[PDB]
Design a binder for this molecule. Structure first.
Ligand SMILES: Nc1ncnc2c1ncn2[C@@H]1O[C@H](COP(=O)(O)OP(=O)(O)OP(=O)(O)O)[C@@H](O)[C@H]1O
Ligand SMILES: [Mg+2]
Lengths: 133, 431, 233, 198, 246, 147, 35, 49
């Protein structure tokens, strides 16, 4: 590339996969696409492993509420970066609420094809879609 | 200002499941009670039954019942009256807060449009009657008993009832949204028809409510303006105007909601279709959804990251750091304020000249500025002469006008002293 | 939707007209030069009343204009305003901005300042047809009414126990004569308005407090000496 | 349509690399013969092309080209640290005449480090590393690492051409004159540069 | 109700004024003196204390009032001396609270005639303490010295009952002043600040300000959001109709 | 957008800062929504992109003591008069007769809702009087302690 | 000058506006030579 | 402009801008010299062509 390249963080993947879920999730249909960071965090902790996901926020976390707030802040920061990437739009007046965009579908490119995960990952990395960590 | 009022009130409310169930049972028995009285002898039985149903024994039945009744009495939920003859020697009655809390859950469902129509008809009859009574007129007591007792209470209560019906419809909208949301979780592609029907019925119900609301809003407004017109028949009818100004907004407010809700719902509806057109069209079997869920659950078993362009930012030159001016300024601090006084000599002179000149106005004598100034300036030294002339002129020109000024004949510069002072003015004739 | 729009604009205009007409009686025939009173004229603009009527009843008849891909909604509104009521002859301003202006209800009212000059009745106040003192008095009247309106609007948010401070200025006061300054003083005191005035000569010797400033060159710098003044001695 | 010569300049196979380096803030001097000649030839059109981005294509009096972002710049802007400008002015000073006999156009990180320590005031050095520091080993090591990082940042800008190896020894280009001060009649460049730095 | 009042205006290290406190009047305060006395300087200092927004402050001559002079200078820098300067207002609230609001001004070194302004407020100061003394330190024989903001904070914190606050944004400064019954309108947005400055600026030069009479609608009539919502609804309807037609 | 302002004002009055204003406001609004006190509607154009309305339980609770605790007999008289008019009208309509739809619209929609609501209102007035009796007993009890 | 200043040298013209025969009229007086 | 600036008093804006136009007369000699130079240039260009 003549233009530099960069890869999203693993936490960014968590939030993007969750965002795709919310785009496809009908339970939150009442929200009508407008979501708050608190709801996103609640859904994230519901589907992910709370403490083992927290491990990445801080290596010495064991459920401490200070580290809990740290994870909330990290999720908020990743959400802002994704907003910069166009995956999410803050509302014309509110930066605490947002509307999802179809771009989030890229976070599911590893599962859009019904095949073995380990072959699709190699296909994607070969195509340059996704590097490993 | 109400924050301090609430703070000093010290009210706050608490109903665990058992207490709430006991309250609901009490309300049901009161509804089915003959004469609307509740002796504690039945309250204890009701608490025993509810506690038995809930299957919990912290203490004896009697102690728990007594504690709960006392807590509700002090929590402003029940009112107690000492009557020895009553079973248990006490009579208990639900308090307004208790009634509200109980009926918040227990009311008959009321979304039928026939209701809204009948309240509107009742309102129409009462409002027309009150308007006609006001228009006919009467004394203060007649005005009261025809426009303040009947109108106020009835209209307030029934507008509140109509608003309550709208709120119940709001609850039903919420419930149907939740039902659609839950259904789409269980059938996915097979609930599309169910959701479309539910949307259809909800939209039709909202439209019919709006139609019923607008079926009488205009005429009620006309009657209310009529009452406004007739209100002015007495000076003590001020309070009436408030209602005639208040009962306006509510009505219009109601009608506003009747459209606004639809404006909201017709919006939300679209989204649902969009969802069906977007969320499920490309996930007909939903397999993509489960597979995404499992990927999220088992992501870190194969942690992968996407690639994005990260072009460099154009580094720029930082503007020079701004340095203020520091010199530790020092200087003498001001003394106490002095004072000076204004000379009223000119005021005295002006009073003198006005008194000396008022005679001309009194007698309507033709005033000639030349001669008057020449005579009067002789009384003062030369340096002051100017300060006199001005003042005199200021006093003279307020007294009538000079008729010669319309003749087109300029006046001459008459000398009024030695040293070369001159004046140009026609004789002042028309006072 | 167009009918509902037109209705809400009409209601807001009526409410604002009533409020301003009630407020007008808060003036008490100020005496400035030949100006004997100041008033605010609020009137719904017929050029805009016709537009409201068309919107509320005849939206469809002009759909051809609304549904053109070339015109945005603001431009569509501007073109419609052009279509009917064509004698206004707006200037070189672009359709976009004039439409955006049309989207604000306040524009629909002519809001002007009238003065009862001498014995000619109430005439529109134009700076080009008023003496310096008359214009100064009229401007002060306008400013006092504006501050009163601001205070009135904030009466809800503020606490019931606080009345905001009131203060205005007037440099080069010497442009006003004794009568005008007396009228200004009586107005300000009736409205509990504080005033800070400046003039080379002490134009108000018998009212309020006064100071006199003298600048002295002193060892290659400057110092201002302030002396209080008193009415009588 | 588009200007014809602008289309010619954009189509030239040199345009992608040069455009990326400009949008990265790099300064194109006389050393880059092909790029400098291309910019010389096609400036009249690239100025308009980059003004469409609310950026200005500036040819310095020394000759080197660069991009200056306006307040309304469409290219994500960024600002150099305080240490970055300080180091830039140090190199501008080191673009000296005795430099020819001193280092013959090739300097080493040690020269820059010693010049920065001796010349700069202690307070700004602490502000760079941290306020509470006072002449310590860890603080000085962190300062040296940040000096290397800012030297790399300048290399990104084309200010400093590294001599190719992991070791830190480089050369200074004429574009560094951007950090320099204006020259008056009879003024000693050394004196004005030091007065600015102080 | 008893309306609050502006007790006095204090000027520190100003052009001509070292430390001068004019005690304002309940109704009218007049300032006289030959040309160049410094009355306009006092007015400018007051208004700076009231609206420290540097974008708005523009001290044109009474002549060319609103006529663009192209000087490129707002005129405030030349009205201050080198070093620290202060401009403070004592206000008696309708709650009979003496509050000293104020601003520290300081010239910015450089060819550009630029200034820096930092607002601040003091509550609960004893009525016996005069701002002129409060802002200066008696150093030497009857040779008081001005002290900077940090020294003022140290001096005030050492006192009992006085609460000193320093604002990082003129927005909070205006909010606090409004809370204490000093400003009629709440200047939440920059447009509100612009309108406020327009009002006081028109008053200072006096008479019919062109901008005022031109925007009398905006100045008098309040903004309504219902009309905006209705217009947005109509906009959405028209957009959908156009989509369908296309 | 106004609910958040109201919560800020009430929290300021109560002088307590457990967390930031925004987080406390959001938690309280969500708690009331789930506690069946408020109903939320998603509208992007609205200030804050949401519209909130009091639910029937919330209306009832609020009015627990901030309704007028009405004891004036003129009220009771006017509700009785309104009831008399509506009841007589419904009785006459029923006596006249009609088809099933007429019977409905004359004896089931008008009668049912109106009579139920206004009898509940009269009962509510009686309950308010009960509250006043309790308050006067307490006032007498407190007075006898002081004099 | 609206009466505020009184320049002693030269000609001075005092003006006063009035209503006469239902028409606005400026009564004018003149002085000169003082000093 | 001169008269009205005197009337209103102060440093008139237009006068300040056009100070050079106002305080300096227009000299025909320089214009004539430039015309002669232009004629010489025209002759030179004709000869070159
Ligand atoms: N920014 C400035 N730079 C330089 N000198 C200034 C500045 N502002 C004011 N001055 C000078 O300070 C002195 C006082 O000016 P100021 O305008 O405050 O006086 P004033 O009392 O209002 O005068 P006047 O009534 O004649 O308008 C004058 O010499 C003025 O020239
Ligand atoms: Mg002045």
């Amino acid at each position: 590339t003549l233009i530099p390249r960069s890869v999203l963080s693993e936490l960014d993947m968590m939030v993007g996969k969750i965002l795709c879920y919310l785009y496809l999730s009908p339970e939150r249909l009442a929200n009508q696409g407008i979501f708050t960071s608190q709801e996103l965090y609640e859904e994230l902790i519901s589907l992910a492993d709370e403490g083992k996901l927290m491990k990445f926020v801080n290596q010495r976390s064991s459920g401490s509420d200070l580290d809990k707030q740290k994870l909330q802040e990290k999720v908020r920061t990743t959400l802002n970066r994704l907003r910069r990437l166009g995956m999410v739009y803050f509302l014309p007046n509110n930066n605490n609420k947002f509307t999802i965009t179809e771009a989030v579908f890229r976070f599911g490119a590893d599962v859009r094809s019904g095949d073995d995960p380990r072959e699709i990952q190699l296909r994607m990395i070969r195509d340059g879609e996704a590097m490993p960590v | 200002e109400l924050v301090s009022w609430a703070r000093k009130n010290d009210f706050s409310i608490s109903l665990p499941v058992e207490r709430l169930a006991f309250l609901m049972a009490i309300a049901v028995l009161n509804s089915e009670r003959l004469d609307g009285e509740m002796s504690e002898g039945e309250l204890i039985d009701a608490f025993r039954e509810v506690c038995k149903g809930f299957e919990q024994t912290a203490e004896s039945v009697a102690v728990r019942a007594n504690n709960a009744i006392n807590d509700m009495v002090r929590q402003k939920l029940l009112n107690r009256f000492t009557s020895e003859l009553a079973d248990g020697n006490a009579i208990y009655r639900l308090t307004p807060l208790g009634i509200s809390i109980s009926d918040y859950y227990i009311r008959q469902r009321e979304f039928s449009t026939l209701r809204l129509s009948m309240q509107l008809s009742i309102v129409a009859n009462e409002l027309h009657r009150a308007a006609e009574a006001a228009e006919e007129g009467g004394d203060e007591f007649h005005w009261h008993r025809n426009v303040f007792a009947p109108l106020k209470y009835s209209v307030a209560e029934i507008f509140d009832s109509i608003d309550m019906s709208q709120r119940l419809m709001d609850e039903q909208q919420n419930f149907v949204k939740e039902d659609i949301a839950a259904l789409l979780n269980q059938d996915w592609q097979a609930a599309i028809a169910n959701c479309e029907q539910l949307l259809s019925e909800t939209s039709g119900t909202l439209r019919e409510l709006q139609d019923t609301l607008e079926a009488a809003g205009d005429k009620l407004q006309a009657n209310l303006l009529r009452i406004q017109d007739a209100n002015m028949g007495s000076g003590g009818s001020e309070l009436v105007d408030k209602l005639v100004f208040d009962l306006q907004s509510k009505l219009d407010r109601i009608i506003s909601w009747g459209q606004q809700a639809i404006d909201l719902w017709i919006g939300y509806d679209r989204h649902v279709h969009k969802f069906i057109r977007t969320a499920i069209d490309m996930d007909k079997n939903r397999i993509f959804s489960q597979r995404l869920r499992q990927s999220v659950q088992h992501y870190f078993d194969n942690p992968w990251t996407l690639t994005v362009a990260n072009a460099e930012r154009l580094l720029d030159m930082r503007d020079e750091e701004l340095a203020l001016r520091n010199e530790e300024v020092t200087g003498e601090l001001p003394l106490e304020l002095e004072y000076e006084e204004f000379s009223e000599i000119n005021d005295q002179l002006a009073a003198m000249i006005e008194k000396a000149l008022l005679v001309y106005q009194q007698e309507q004598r033709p005033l000639d500025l030349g001669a008057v100034l020449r005579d009067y300036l002789a009384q003062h030294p030369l340096p002051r002469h100017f300060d006199v002339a001005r003042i005199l002129v200021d006093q003279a020109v307020r007294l009538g006008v000079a008729e010669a000024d319309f003749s087109g004949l300029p006046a001459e510069w008459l000398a009024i002293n030695d040293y070369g002072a001159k004046v140009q003015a026609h004789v002042i004739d028309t006072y | 939707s167009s009918k509902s729009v037109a209705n809400i604009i009409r209601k807001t205009i009526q409410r604002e007209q009533n409020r301003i007409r009630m407020l007008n009686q808060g003036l008490q025939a100020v005496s400035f030069g030949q100006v004997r009173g100041v008033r605010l004229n609020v009137n719904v603009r017929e050029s805009h009343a016709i537009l409201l009527d068309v919107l509320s009843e005849q939206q469809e008849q002009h759909q051809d204009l609304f549904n053109s891909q070339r015109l945005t909604f603001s431009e569509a509104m501007a073109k419609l305003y052009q279509r009917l009521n064509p004698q206004v002859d707006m200037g070189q301003r672009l359709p976009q901005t004039i439409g955006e202006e049309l989207l604000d209800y306040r524009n629909y009212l002519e809001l002007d300042v009238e003065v009862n000059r001498g014995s000619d009745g109430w005439l529109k106040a134009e700076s080009g047809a008023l003496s310096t003192g008359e214009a100064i008095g009229t401007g002060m009247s306008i400013l006092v009414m504006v501050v009163q309106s601001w205070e009135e609007e904030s009466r809800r948010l503020r606490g019931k126990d606080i009345s905001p401070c009131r203060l205005l200025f007037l440099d080069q006061a010497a442009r006003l004569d004794a009568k005008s300054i007396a009228t200004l003083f009586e107005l300000c005191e009736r409205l509990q308005m504080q005033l800070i005035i400046a003039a080379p000569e002490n134009i108000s010797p018998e009212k309020g407090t006064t100071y006199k400033l003298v600048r002295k060159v002193f060892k290659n710098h400057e110092h201002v000496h302030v002396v209080g003044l008193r009415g009588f001695g | 349509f588009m200007p014809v010569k602008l289309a010619q300049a954009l189509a030239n196979s040199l345009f992608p690399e040069l455009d990326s380096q400009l949008r990265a803030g790099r300064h194109i001097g006389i050393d880059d013969l092909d790029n400098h000649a291309f910019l010389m030839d096609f400036q009249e059109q690239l100025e308009e092309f980059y003004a469409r981005y609310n950026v200005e294509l500036i040819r310095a009096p020394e000759g080197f080209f660069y991009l200056r972002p306006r307040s309304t710049t469409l290219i994500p802007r960024s600002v150099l640290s305080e240490l970055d400008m300080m180091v830039g002015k140090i190199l501008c000073y080191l673009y000296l005449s005795p430099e020819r006999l001193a280092n013959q156009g090739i300097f080493t990180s040690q020269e820059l480090y010693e010049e920065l320590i001796s010349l700069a005031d202690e307070g700004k050095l602490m502000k760079f590393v941290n306020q509470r520091s006072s002449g310590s080993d860890l603080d000085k090591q962190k300062l040296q690492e940040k000096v290397r990082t800012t030297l790399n940042r300048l290399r990104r800008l084309g200010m400093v051409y590294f001599l190719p190896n992991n070791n830190n020894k480089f050369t200074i280009t004429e574009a560094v004159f951007r950090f320099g001060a204006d020259v008056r009649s009879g003024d000693d460049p050394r004196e004005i540069q030091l007065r600015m730095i102080r | 109700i008893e309306r609050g009042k502006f007790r006095s205006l204090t000027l520190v290290n100003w052009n001509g004024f070292f430390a001068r406190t004019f005690d304002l009047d309940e109704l009218v305060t007049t300032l006289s003196g030959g040309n160049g006395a410094g009355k306009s300087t006092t007015m400018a200092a007051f208004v700076t204390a009231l609206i420290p927004d540097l974008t708005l402050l523009h001290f044109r001559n009474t002549t060319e009032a609103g006529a663009t002079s192209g000087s490129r200078d707002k005129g405030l820098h030349g009205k201050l001396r080198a070093g620290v300067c202060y401009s403070t207002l004592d206000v008696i609230n309708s709650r009979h609270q003496r509050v000293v609001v104020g601003v520290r001004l300081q010239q910015v070194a450089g060819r550009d005639r630029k200034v820096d302004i930092k607002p601040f407020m003091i509550q609960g100061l004893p009525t016996a303490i005069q701002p002129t003394q409060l802002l200066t330190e008696n150093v030497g024989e009857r040779q008081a010295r001005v002290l900077p903001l940090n020294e003022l904070k140290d001096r005030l914190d050492e006192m009992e009952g006085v609460q000193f606050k320093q604002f990082n944004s003129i927005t909070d400064y205006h909010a606090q002043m409004f809370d204490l019954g000093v400003i009629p309108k709440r200047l939440r947005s920059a447009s509100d600040r612009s309108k406020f400055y327009r009002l006081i600026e028109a008053s200072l030069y006096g008479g019919i300000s062109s901008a005022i009479t031109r925007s009398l609608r905006d100045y008098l009539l309040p903004e309504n959001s219902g009309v905006r919502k209705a217009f947005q609804d109509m906009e959405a309807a028209l957009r959908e109709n156009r989509i369908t037609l296309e």
